[PDB]
Amino acid sequence: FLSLDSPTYVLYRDRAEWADIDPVPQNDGPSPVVQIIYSEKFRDVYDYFRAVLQRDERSERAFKLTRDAIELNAANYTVWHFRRVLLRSLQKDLQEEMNYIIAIIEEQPKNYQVWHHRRVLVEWLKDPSQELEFIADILNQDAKNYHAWQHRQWVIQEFRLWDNELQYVDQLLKEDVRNNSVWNQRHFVISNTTGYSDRAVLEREVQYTLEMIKLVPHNESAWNYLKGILQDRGLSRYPNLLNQLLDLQPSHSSPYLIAFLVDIYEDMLENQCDNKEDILNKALELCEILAKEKDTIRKEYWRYIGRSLQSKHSRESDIPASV
Amino acid sequence: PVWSEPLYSLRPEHARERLQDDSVETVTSIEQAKVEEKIQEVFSSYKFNHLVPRLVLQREKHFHYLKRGLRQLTDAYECLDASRPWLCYWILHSLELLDEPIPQIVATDVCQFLELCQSPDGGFGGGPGQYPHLAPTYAAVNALCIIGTEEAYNVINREKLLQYLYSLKQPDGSFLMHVGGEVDVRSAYCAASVASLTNIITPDLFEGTAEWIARCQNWEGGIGGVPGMEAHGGYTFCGLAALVILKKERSLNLKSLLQWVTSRQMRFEGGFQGRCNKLVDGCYSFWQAGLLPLLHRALHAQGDPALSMSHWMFHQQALQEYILMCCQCPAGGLLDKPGKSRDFYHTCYCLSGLSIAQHFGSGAMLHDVVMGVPENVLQPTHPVYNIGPDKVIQATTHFLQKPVPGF
Ligand SMILES: Cc1ccccc1S(=O)(=O)N(CCN(Cc1cncn1C)c1ccc(C#N)cc1)Cc1ccccc1
Ligand SMILES: CC(C)=CCC/C(C)=C/CC/C(C)=C/COP(=O)(O)OP(=O)(O)O
Ligand SMILES: [Zn+2]
């Protein structure tokens, strides 16, 4: 009906069809704190909202009023709750409401309430058929929107819509290989479909990641994904990894490659590798390089790591004090 | 030496910390480069203006901004009309950090307003007449604890609060943020925080909650909002802090968490990003850097022998430099990054993070690092609740005089 931004918008206190209702002023007390000096339009809508809420008036006019209250403050979760009460009480068409929430999310996508509302609608309708395309449009504008990725995971998992998501992930990694949300989505998809224990899958994923590392050696996301998919089994379980990373040292180096080396060495020492001492000193040398030159922002972390490795892996570490 | 620059961000080597994009441009690298150029201008402004750098926390300006906001806000704050207890908390905490006393007149007015925000069925809403919600409930309880008077403590209906928490509890261990609302790790933290402060924790209230939080830790080492989601500083703080309250930090892989958080400090800017490959933001000075004290305490309780006894495991100096040089509005208030506007939320968390960066404490051991003028030093904050540690102790002691509702 009358859009909040319409040139001919009129205050609720001036509307004939609201004449019967006394608006309800906010009760901030005799000496207010954090008192917001609301605009006229804002205070007018919310005075009327307080009135319909207080009376629990479940009417078409109250339903339309929630649209304005939401537009004025989409984070007002009380208004959203009442709007959902009205959707059910008035038996409103839920596909019309889906059209509404898609428009609102498009304009204010960084808001918890709007995404939760959309989830409730999808649950009520048991219809996920618009979701992936809708979310894709939001991600086309902000490829890192946290709520959008979260809703996407919920939709995929709840409705088992796994079949095309790896393809979607590959598309987004092509657009921006530094997009960490997308690396996260890659792990989410693989973990819940094939899993990473399938050797062919793990192999494919490591080769792919190494290929991205070669293309963009300072991209931290690829480095974190490589570590993430290997670390629970233990980096030292993969003896070829070390040599192959050392082979990137010359013209593909980074503080990330160096840090990964330390992580490889750390696991080796934990699993009683050959040449305990040789490995230790290699690791300590690297920790020092990182702390003093290559990654000084993390000097406290790297000194802590060097200290930890020394404390438990030095030849003297298991030697009784009397010796 | 005379040629030596005492500020880490102004040293000549620091230029080597600029982004290397490997000649492959994407939206991510373009955006990072834009921030770095703006920050470099800030860093170099002294040199180009031929002045000696002096890092001063603009206390009087911040106090004026806070004192007024505690009473009245412009319509710029309409979007926070359902978060008024957060405004009370952010402002009162900032004032506490700045060691500015709270007039009893103000204290009593805050108490009375929060009473009006309290629901008959327990918890606090975003404003008077609003349904209760765990976020303003957390804020309201923190604010009342910062005030710390008998009147303030008495505002909280403890019996109804517990009932409210039970009404939000889910079978999988998680909590709804509010009735008919969303679930994420924020709710676990909000619930743990208010229940522990007010001594209403029953034997089964948090059954399954530690395990649910641990499922939110992912392949990155940090914690996402729900299981499966990308690791983020805000959710990671909520997850670890709730586990500390529950005495269940060991449920997490603390080592992968430590590696993840330390990697979130930006080598050039000195501040922290909220997740991998996104931008620095002053409020993560708290959410991210606040994890380091939590991890220190946790690792120490495990008898970790290699822990520093004077510093947190992040660059305390670089963080203070970022906050002092980049995050202050000359008119008063702090902000996200240069070019953004001041707001009470960033004022709260930038100062909270500055305090953490200034103060190391591990039992008997204490060490301060105060960059810039000595008057820059803030009051310490408790890394779990983010109110003064004195206020935490005083509140917990007071409520322990009461029995857990139901006995
Ligand atoms: C944490 C909180 C507290 C009260 C109300 C809302 C929120 S929030 O969960 O919506 N939160 C804070 C929302 N936010 C936006 C934000 C914070 N940092 C960067 N941004 C864009 C705010 C900005 C200013 C104020 C004030 N006054 C209050 C919230 C989201 C968020 C946190 C960190 C980075 C980005 C987004
Ligand atoms: C107790 C309590 C309520 C704590 C709040 C915890 C907190 C800070 C959560 C942040 C969640 C979130 C929506 C991040 C994305 O914002 P973004 O994409 O605009 O920011 P980004 O680029 O820095 O991830
Ligand atoms: Zn912020």
mmCIF file with all atom_site columns, N, CA and C in Angstrom, chain B residues 91-149:
data_model
loop_
_atom_site.group_PDB
_atom_site.id
_atom_site.type_symbol
_atom_site.label_atom_id
_atom_site.label_alt_id
_atom_site.label_comp_id
_atom_site.label_asym_id
_atom_site.label_entity_id
_atom_site.label_seq_id
_atom_site.pdbx_PDB_ins_code
_atom_site.Cartn_x
_atom_site.Cartn_y
_atom_site.Cartn_z
_atom_site.occupancy
_atom_site.B_iso_or_equiv
_atom_site.pdbx_formal_charge
_atom_site.auth_seq_id
_atom_site.auth_comp_id
_atom_site.auth_asym_id
_atom_site.auth_atom_id
_atom_site.pdbx_PDB_model_num
ATOM 1   N N  . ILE B 1 91  ? 28.729 1.997   27.108 1.00 0.00 ? 91  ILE B N  1
ATOM 2   C CA . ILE B 1 91  ? 29.110 3.307   27.627 1.00 0.00 ? 91  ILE B CA 1
ATOM 3   C C  . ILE B 1 91  ? 29.631 3.214   29.047 1.00 0.00 ? 91  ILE B C  1
ATOM 4   N N  . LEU B 1 92  ? 28.898 2.528   29.912 1.00 0.00 ? 92  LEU B N  1
ATOM 5   C CA . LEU B 1 92  ? 29.379 2.325   31.274 1.00 0.00 ? 92  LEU B CA 1
ATOM 6   C C  . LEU B 1 92  ? 30.740 1.616   31.331 1.00 0.00 ? 92  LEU B C  1
ATOM 7   N N  . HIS B 1 93  ? 30.959 0.617   30.476 1.00 0.00 ? 93  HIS B N  1
ATOM 8   C CA . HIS B 1 93  ? 32.248 -0.076  30.453 1.00 0.00 ? 93  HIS B CA 1
ATOM 9   C C  . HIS B 1 93  ? 33.394 0.814   29.959 1.00 0.00 ? 93  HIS B C  1
ATOM 10  N N  . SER B 1 94  ? 33.139 1.611   28.924 1.00 0.00 ? 94  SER B N  1
ATOM 11  C CA . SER B 1 94  ? 34.131 2.547   28.431 1.00 0.00 ? 94  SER B CA 1
ATOM 12  C C  . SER B 1 94  ? 34.533 3.518   29.561 1.00 0.00 ? 94  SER B C  1
ATOM 13  N N  . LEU B 1 95  ? 33.540 4.034   30.271 1.00 0.00 ? 95  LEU B N  1
ATOM 14  C CA . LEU B 1 95  ? 33.793 4.968   31.373 1.00 0.00 ? 95  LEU B CA 1
ATOM 15  C C  . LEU B 1 95  ? 34.613 4.293   32.468 1.00 0.00 ? 95  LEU B C  1
ATOM 16  N N  . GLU B 1 96  ? 34.300 3.028   32.745 1.00 0.00 ? 96  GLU B N  1
ATOM 17  C CA . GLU B 1 96  ? 35.034 2.205   33.728 1.00 0.00 ? 96  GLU B CA 1
ATOM 18  C C  . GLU B 1 96  ? 36.497 2.037   33.325 1.00 0.00 ? 96  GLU B C  1
ATOM 19  N N  . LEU B 1 97  ? 36.726 1.756   32.048 1.00 0.00 ? 97  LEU B N  1
ATOM 20  C CA . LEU B 1 97  ? 38.077 1.587   31.542 1.00 0.00 ? 97  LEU B CA 1
ATOM 21  C C  . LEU B 1 97  ? 38.858 2.892   31.670 1.00 0.00 ? 97  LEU B C  1
ATOM 22  N N  . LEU B 1 98  ? 38.161 4.008   31.485 1.00 0.00 ? 98  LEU B N  1
ATOM 23  C CA . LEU B 1 98  ? 38.771 5.325   31.564 1.00 0.00 ? 98  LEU B CA 1
ATOM 24  C C  . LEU B 1 98  ? 38.823 5.817   33.014 1.00 0.00 ? 98  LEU B C  1
ATOM 25  N N  . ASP B 1 99  ? 38.426 4.960   33.943 1.00 0.00 ? 99  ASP B N  1
ATOM 26  C CA . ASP B 1 99  ? 38.456 5.290   35.364 1.00 0.00 ? 99  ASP B CA 1
ATOM 27  C C  . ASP B 1 99  ? 37.662 6.561   35.683 1.00 0.00 ? 99  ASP B C  1
ATOM 28  N N  . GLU B 1 100 ? 36.497 6.701   35.056 1.00 0.00 ? 100 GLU B N  1
ATOM 29  C CA . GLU B 1 100 ? 35.589 7.807   35.327 1.00 0.00 ? 100 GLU B CA 1
ATOM 30  C C  . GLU B 1 100 ? 34.447 7.304   36.197 1.00 0.00 ? 100 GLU B C  1
ATOM 31  N N  . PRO B 1 101 ? 34.214 7.952   37.343 1.00 0.00 ? 101 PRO B N  1
ATOM 32  C CA . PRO B 1 101 ? 33.238 7.410   38.284 1.00 0.00 ? 101 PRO B CA 1
ATOM 33  C C  . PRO B 1 101 ? 31.811 7.538   37.759 1.00 0.00 ? 101 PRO B C  1
ATOM 34  N N  . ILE B 1 102 ? 30.937 6.654   38.216 1.00 0.00 ? 102 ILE B N  1
ATOM 35  C CA . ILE B 1 102 ? 29.544 6.691   37.814 1.00 0.00 ? 102 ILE B CA 1
ATOM 36  C C  . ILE B 1 102 ? 28.742 7.356   38.917 1.00 0.00 ? 102 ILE B C  1
ATOM 37  N N  . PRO B 1 103 ? 28.256 8.584   38.677 1.00 0.00 ? 103 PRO B N  1
ATOM 38  C CA . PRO B 1 103 ? 27.446 9.279   39.680 1.00 0.00 ? 103 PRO B CA 1
ATOM 39  C C  . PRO B 1 103 ? 26.302 8.388   40.143 1.00 0.00 ? 103 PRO B C  1
ATOM 40  N N  . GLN B 1 104 ? 25.982 8.428   41.431 1.00 0.00 ? 104 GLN B N  1
ATOM 41  C CA . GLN B 1 104 ? 24.925 7.581   41.971 1.00 0.00 ? 104 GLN B CA 1
ATOM 42  C C  . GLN B 1 104 ? 23.574 7.895   41.345 1.00 0.00 ? 104 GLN B C  1
ATOM 43  N N  . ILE B 1 105 ? 23.393 9.157   40.979 1.00 0.00 ? 105 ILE B N  1
ATOM 44  C CA . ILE B 1 105 ? 22.213 9.591   40.266 1.00 0.00 ? 105 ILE B CA 1
ATOM 45  C C  . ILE B 1 105 ? 22.096 8.834   38.939 1.00 0.00 ? 105 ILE B C  1
ATOM 46  N N  . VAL B 1 106 ? 23.211 8.753   38.220 1.00 0.00 ? 106 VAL B N  1
ATOM 47  C CA . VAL B 1 106 ? 23.256 8.010   36.967 1.00 0.00 ? 106 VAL B CA 1
ATOM 48  C C  . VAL B 1 106 ? 23.035 6.514   37.226 1.00 0.00 ? 106 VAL B C  1
ATOM 49  N N  . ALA B 1 107 ? 23.768 5.968   38.187 1.00 0.00 ? 107 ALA B N  1
ATOM 50  C CA . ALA B 1 107 ? 23.614 4.563   38.551 1.00 0.00 ? 107 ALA B CA 1
ATOM 51  C C  . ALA B 1 107 ? 22.143 4.193   38.773 1.00 0.00 ? 107 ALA B C  1
ATOM 52  N N  . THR B 1 108 ? 21.457 4.956   39.613 1.00 0.00 ? 108 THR B N  1
ATOM 53  C CA . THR B 1 108 ? 20.057 4.678   39.906 1.00 0.00 ? 108 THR B CA 1
ATOM 54  C C  . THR B 1 108 ? 19.156 4.806   38.666 1.00 0.00 ? 108 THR B C  1
ATOM 55  N N  . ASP B 1 109 ? 19.409 5.799   37.809 1.00 0.00 ? 109 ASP B N  1
ATOM 56  C CA . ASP B 1 109 ? 18.622 5.941   36.571 1.00 0.00 ? 109 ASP B CA 1
ATOM 57  C C  . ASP B 1 109 ? 18.829 4.751   35.616 1.00 0.00 ? 109 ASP B C  1
ATOM 58  N N  . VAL B 1 110 ? 20.050 4.248   35.542 1.00 0.00 ? 110 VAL B N  1
ATOM 59  C CA . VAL B 1 110 ? 20.324 3.064   34.725 1.00 0.00 ? 110 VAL B CA 1
ATOM 60  C C  . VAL B 1 110 ? 19.588 1.849   35.276 1.00 0.00 ? 110 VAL B C  1
ATOM 61  N N  . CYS B 1 111 ? 19.641 1.668   36.590 1.00 0.00 ? 111 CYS B N  1
ATOM 62  C CA . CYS B 1 111 ? 18.921 0.588   37.251 1.00 0.00 ? 111 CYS B CA 1
ATOM 63  C C  . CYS B 1 111 ? 17.448 0.596   36.897 1.00 0.00 ? 111 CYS B C  1
ATOM 64  N N  . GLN B 1 112 ? 16.832 1.768   37.009 1.00 0.00 ? 112 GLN B N  1
ATOM 65  C CA . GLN B 1 112 ? 15.410 1.907   36.781 1.00 0.00 ? 112 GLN B CA 1
ATOM 66  C C  . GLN B 1 112 ? 15.061 1.657   35.324 1.00 0.00 ? 112 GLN B C  1
ATOM 67  N N  . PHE B 1 113 ? 15.906 2.115   34.406 1.00 0.00 ? 113 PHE B N  1
ATOM 68  C CA . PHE B 1 113 ? 15.632 1.864   32.998 1.00 0.00 ? 113 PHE B CA 1
ATOM 69  C C  . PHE B 1 113 ? 15.718 0.359   32.697 1.00 0.00 ? 113 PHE B C  1
ATOM 70  N N  . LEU B 1 114 ? 16.752 -0.295  33.212 1.00 0.00 ? 114 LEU B N  1
ATOM 71  C CA . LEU B 1 114 ? 16.907 -1.731  32.971 1.00 0.00 ? 114 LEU B CA 1
ATOM 72  C C  . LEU B 1 114 ? 15.766 -2.530  33.600 1.00 0.00 ? 114 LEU B C  1
ATOM 73  N N  . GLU B 1 115 ? 15.233 -2.047  34.719 1.00 0.00 ? 115 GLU B N  1
ATOM 74  C CA . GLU B 1 115 ? 14.042 -2.674  35.288 1.00 0.00 ? 115 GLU B CA 1
ATOM 75  C C  . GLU B 1 115 ? 12.895 -2.673  34.298 1.00 0.00 ? 115 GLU B C  1
ATOM 76  N N  . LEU B 1 116 ? 12.716 -1.555  33.608 1.00 0.00 ? 116 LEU B N  1
ATOM 77  C CA . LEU B 1 116 ? 11.653 -1.422  32.628 1.00 0.00 ? 116 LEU B CA 1
ATOM 78  C C  . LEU B 1 116 ? 11.877 -2.342  31.430 1.00 0.00 ? 116 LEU B C  1
ATOM 79  N N  . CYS B 1 117 ? 13.129 -2.726  31.197 1.00 0.00 ? 117 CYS B N  1
ATOM 80  C CA . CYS B 1 117 ? 13.465 -3.599  30.061 1.00 0.00 ? 117 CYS B CA 1
ATOM 81  C C  . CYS B 1 117 ? 13.309 -5.071  30.447 1.00 0.00 ? 117 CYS B C  1
ATOM 82  N N  . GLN B 1 118 ? 13.165 -5.338  31.743 1.00 0.00 ? 118 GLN B N  1
ATOM 83  C CA . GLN B 1 118 ? 13.081 -6.719  32.210 1.00 0.00 ? 118 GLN B CA 1
ATOM 84  C C  . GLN B 1 118 ? 11.697 -7.309  31.960 1.00 0.00 ? 118 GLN B C  1
ATOM 85  N N  . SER B 1 119 ? 11.660 -8.498  31.376 1.00 0.00 ? 119 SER B N  1
ATOM 86  C CA . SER B 1 119 ? 10.410 -9.186  31.100 1.00 0.00 ? 119 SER B CA 1
ATOM 87  C C  . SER B 1 119 ? 9.840  -9.837  32.370 1.00 0.00 ? 119 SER B C  1
ATOM 88  N N  . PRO B 1 120 ? 8.506  -9.869  32.489 1.00 0.00 ? 120 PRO B N  1
ATOM 89  C CA . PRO B 1 120 ? 7.857  -10.529 33.624 1.00 0.00 ? 120 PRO B CA 1
ATOM 90  C C  . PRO B 1 120 ? 8.247  -12.005 33.711 1.00 0.00 ? 120 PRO B C  1
ATOM 91  N N  . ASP B 1 121 ? 8.506  -12.619 32.562 1.00 0.00 ? 121 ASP B N  1
ATOM 92  C CA . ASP B 1 121 ? 8.847  -14.033 32.526 1.00 0.00 ? 121 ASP B CA 1
ATOM 93  C C  . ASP B 1 121 ? 10.359 -14.281 32.487 1.00 0.00 ? 121 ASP B C  1
ATOM 94  N N  . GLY B 1 122 ? 11.134 -13.223 32.726 1.00 0.00 ? 122 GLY B N  1
ATOM 95  C CA . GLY B 1 122 ? 12.575 -13.345 32.889 1.00 0.00 ? 122 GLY B CA 1
ATOM 96  C C  . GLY B 1 122 ? 13.366 -12.861 31.682 1.00 0.00 ? 122 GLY B C  1
ATOM 97  N N  . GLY B 1 123 ? 14.596 -12.431 31.934 1.00 0.00 ? 123 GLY B N  1
ATOM 98  C CA . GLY B 1 123 ? 15.455 -11.889 30.878 1.00 0.00 ? 123 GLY B CA 1
ATOM 99  C C  . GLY B 1 123 ? 15.158 -10.423 30.622 1.00 0.00 ? 123 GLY B C  1
ATOM 100 N N  . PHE B 1 124 ? 15.974 -9.793  29.788 1.00 0.00 ? 124 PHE B N  1
ATOM 101 C CA . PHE B 1 124 ? 15.793 -8.400  29.465 1.00 0.00 ? 124 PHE B CA 1
ATOM 102 C C  . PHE B 1 124 ? 15.576 -8.258  27.957 1.00 0.00 ? 124 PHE B C  1
ATOM 103 N N  . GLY B 1 125 ? 14.710 -7.327  27.572 1.00 0.00 ? 125 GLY B N  1
ATOM 104 C CA . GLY B 1 125 ? 14.529 -7.002  26.154 1.00 0.00 ? 125 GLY B CA 1
ATOM 105 C C  . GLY B 1 125 ? 15.378 -5.822  25.719 1.00 0.00 ? 125 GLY B C  1
ATOM 106 N N  . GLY B 1 126 ? 15.277 -5.467  24.435 1.00 0.00 ? 126 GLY B N  1
ATOM 107 C CA . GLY B 1 126 ? 16.086 -4.408  23.842 1.00 0.00 ? 126 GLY B CA 1
ATOM 108 C C  . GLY B 1 126 ? 15.620 -3.021  24.236 1.00 0.00 ? 126 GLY B C  1
ATOM 109 N N  . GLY B 1 127 ? 14.485 -2.951  24.912 1.00 0.00 ? 127 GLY B N  1
ATOM 110 C CA . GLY B 1 127 ? 13.906 -1.671  25.315 1.00 0.00 ? 127 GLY B CA 1
ATOM 111 C C  . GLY B 1 127 ? 12.630 -1.995  26.062 1.00 0.00 ? 127 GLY B C  1
ATOM 112 N N  . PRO B 1 128 ? 11.993 -0.990  26.683 1.00 0.00 ? 128 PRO B N  1
ATOM 113 C CA . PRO B 1 128 ? 10.805 -1.290  27.482 1.00 0.00 ? 128 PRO B CA 1
ATOM 114 C C  . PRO B 1 128 ? 9.666  -1.817  26.630 1.00 0.00 ? 128 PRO B C  1
ATOM 115 N N  . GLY B 1 129 ? 9.051  -2.928  27.031 1.00 0.00 ? 129 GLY B N  1
ATOM 116 C CA . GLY B 1 129 ? 7.947  -3.473  26.253 1.00 0.00 ? 129 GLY B CA 1
ATOM 117 C C  . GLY B 1 129 ? 8.382  -4.442  25.165 1.00 0.00 ? 129 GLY B C  1
ATOM 118 N N  . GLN B 1 130 ? 9.691  -4.655  25.034 1.00 0.00 ? 130 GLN B N  1
ATOM 119 C CA . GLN B 1 130 ? 10.192 -5.569  24.032 1.00 0.00 ? 130 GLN B CA 1
ATOM 120 C C  . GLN B 1 130 ? 10.332 -6.952  24.648 1.00 0.00 ? 130 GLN B C  1
ATOM 121 N N  . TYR B 1 131 ? 10.184 -7.990  23.839 1.00 0.00 ? 131 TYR B N  1
ATOM 122 C CA . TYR B 1 131 ? 10.358 -9.358  24.338 1.00 0.00 ? 131 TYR B CA 1
ATOM 123 C C  . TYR B 1 131 ? 11.810 -9.555  24.808 1.00 0.00 ? 131 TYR B C  1
ATOM 124 N N  . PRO B 1 132 ? 12.029 -10.482 25.754 1.00 0.00 ? 132 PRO B N  1
ATOM 125 C CA . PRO B 1 132 ? 13.398 -10.699 26.210 1.00 0.00 ? 132 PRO B CA 1
ATOM 126 C C  . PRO B 1 132 ? 14.252 -11.387 25.132 1.00 0.00 ? 132 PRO B C  1
ATOM 127 N N  . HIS B 1 133 ? 15.565 -11.240 25.222 1.00 0.00 ? 133 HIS B N  1
ATOM 128 C CA . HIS B 1 133 ? 16.471 -11.755 24.196 1.00 0.00 ? 133 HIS B CA 1
ATOM 129 C C  . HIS B 1 133 ? 17.803 -11.918 24.921 1.00 0.00 ? 133 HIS B C  1
ATOM 130 N N  . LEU B 1 134 ? 18.554 -12.987 24.641 1.00 0.00 ? 134 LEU B N  1
ATOM 131 C CA . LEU B 1 134 ? 19.818 -13.217 25.395 1.00 0.00 ? 134 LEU B CA 1
ATOM 132 C C  . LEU B 1 134 ? 20.892 -12.137 25.243 1.00 0.00 ? 134 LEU B C  1
ATOM 133 N N  . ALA B 1 135 ? 20.917 -11.442 24.107 1.00 0.00 ? 135 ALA B N  1
ATOM 134 C CA . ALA B 1 135 ? 21.958 -10.430 23.912 1.00 0.00 ? 135 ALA B CA 1
ATOM 135 C C  . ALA B 1 135 ? 21.774 -9.204  24.834 1.00 0.00 ? 135 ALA B C  1
ATOM 136 N N  . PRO B 1 136 ? 20.586 -8.575  24.798 1.00 0.00 ? 136 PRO B N  1
ATOM 137 C CA . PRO B 1 136 ? 20.357 -7.500  25.778 1.00 0.00 ? 136 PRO B CA 1
ATOM 138 C C  . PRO B 1 136 ? 20.310 -7.980  27.226 1.00 0.00 ? 136 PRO B C  1
ATOM 139 N N  . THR B 1 137 ? 19.959 -9.244  27.446 1.00 0.00 ? 137 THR B N  1
ATOM 140 C CA . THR B 1 137 ? 20.071 -9.860  28.785 1.00 0.00 ? 137 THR B CA 1
ATOM 141 C C  . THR B 1 137 ? 21.521 -9.876  29.291 1.00 0.00 ? 137 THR B C  1
ATOM 142 N N  . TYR B 1 138 ? 22.440 -10.356 28.463 1.00 0.00 ? 138 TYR B N  1
ATOM 143 C CA . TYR B 1 138 ? 23.881 -10.288 28.742 1.00 0.00 ? 138 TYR B CA 1
ATOM 144 C C  . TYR B 1 138 ? 24.359 -8.851  29.014 1.00 0.00 ? 138 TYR B C  1
ATOM 145 N N  . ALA B 1 139 ? 23.975 -7.930  28.129 1.00 0.00 ? 139 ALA B N  1
ATOM 146 C CA . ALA B 1 139 ? 24.346 -6.528  28.275 1.00 0.00 ? 139 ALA B CA 1
ATOM 147 C C  . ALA B 1 139 ? 23.811 -5.941  29.573 1.00 0.00 ? 139 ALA B C  1
ATOM 148 N N  . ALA B 1 140 ? 22.540 -6.215  29.860 1.00 0.00 ? 140 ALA B N  1
ATOM 149 C CA . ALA B 1 140 ? 21.898 -5.656  31.036 1.00 0.00 ? 140 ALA B CA 1
ATOM 150 C C  . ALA B 1 140 ? 22.590 -6.155  32.300 1.00 0.00 ? 140 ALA B C  1
ATOM 151 N N  . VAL B 1 141 ? 22.884 -7.448  32.352 1.00 0.00 ? 141 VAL B N  1
ATOM 152 C CA . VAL B 1 141 ? 23.542 -8.001  33.547 1.00 0.00 ? 141 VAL B CA 1
ATOM 153 C C  . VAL B 1 141 ? 24.947 -7.446  33.729 1.00 0.00 ? 141 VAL B C  1
ATOM 154 N N  . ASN B 1 142 ? 25.702 -7.317  32.634 1.00 0.00 ? 142 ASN B N  1
ATOM 155 C CA . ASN B 1 142 ? 27.014 -6.694  32.709 1.00 0.00 ? 142 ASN B CA 1
ATOM 156 C C  . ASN B 1 142 ? 26.940 -5.240  33.204 1.00 0.00 ? 142 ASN B C  1
ATOM 157 N N  . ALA B 1 143 ? 26.012 -4.469  32.649 1.00 0.00 ? 143 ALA B N  1
ATOM 158 C CA . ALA B 1 143 ? 25.849 -3.085  33.071 1.00 0.00 ? 143 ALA B CA 1
ATOM 159 C C  . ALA B 1 143 ? 25.547 -2.996  34.574 1.00 0.00 ? 143 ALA B C  1
ATOM 160 N N  . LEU B 1 144 ? 24.581 -3.789  35.040 1.00 0.00 ? 144 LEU B N  1
ATOM 161 C CA . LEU B 1 144 ? 24.224 -3.788  36.454 1.00 0.00 ? 144 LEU B CA 1
ATOM 162 C C  . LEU B 1 144 ? 25.419 -4.199  37.332 1.00 0.00 ? 144 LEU B C  1
ATOM 163 N N  . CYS B 1 145 ? 26.238 -5.128  36.843 1.00 0.00 ? 145 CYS B N  1
ATOM 164 C CA . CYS B 1 145 ? 27.424 -5.574  37.575 1.00 0.00 ? 145 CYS B CA 1
ATOM 165 C C  . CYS B 1 145 ? 28.514 -4.502  37.596 1.00 0.00 ? 145 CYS B C  1
ATOM 166 N N  . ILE B 1 146 ? 28.601 -3.722  36.523 1.00 0.00 ? 146 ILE B N  1
ATOM 167 C CA . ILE B 1 146 ? 29.531 -2.601  36.509 1.00 0.00 ? 146 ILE B CA 1
ATOM 168 C C  . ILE B 1 146 ? 29.110 -1.570  37.555 1.00 0.00 ? 146 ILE B C  1
ATOM 169 N N  . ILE B 1 147 ? 27.809 -1.357  37.713 1.00 0.00 ? 147 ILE B N  1
ATOM 170 C CA . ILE B 1 147 ? 27.335 -0.424  38.732 1.00 0.00 ? 147 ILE B CA 1
ATOM 171 C C  . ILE B 1 147 ? 27.635 -1.021  40.116 1.00 0.00 ? 147 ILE B C  1
ATOM 172 N N  . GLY B 1 148 ? 27.239 -2.271  40.315 1.00 0.00 ? 148 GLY B N  1
ATOM 173 C CA . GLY B 1 148 ? 27.712 -3.044  41.453 1.00 0.00 ? 148 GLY B CA 1
ATOM 174 C C  . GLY B 1 148 ? 27.139 -2.704  42.817 1.00 0.00 ? 148 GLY B C  1
ATOM 175 N N  . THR B 1 149 ? 26.110 -1.870  42.855 1.00 0.00 ? 149 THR B N  1
ATOM 176 C CA . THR B 1 149 ? 25.429 -1.565  44.107 1.00 0.00 ? 149 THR B CA 1
ATOM 177 C C  . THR B 1 149 ? 24.381 -2.615  44.427 1.00 0.00 ? 149 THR B C  1
#
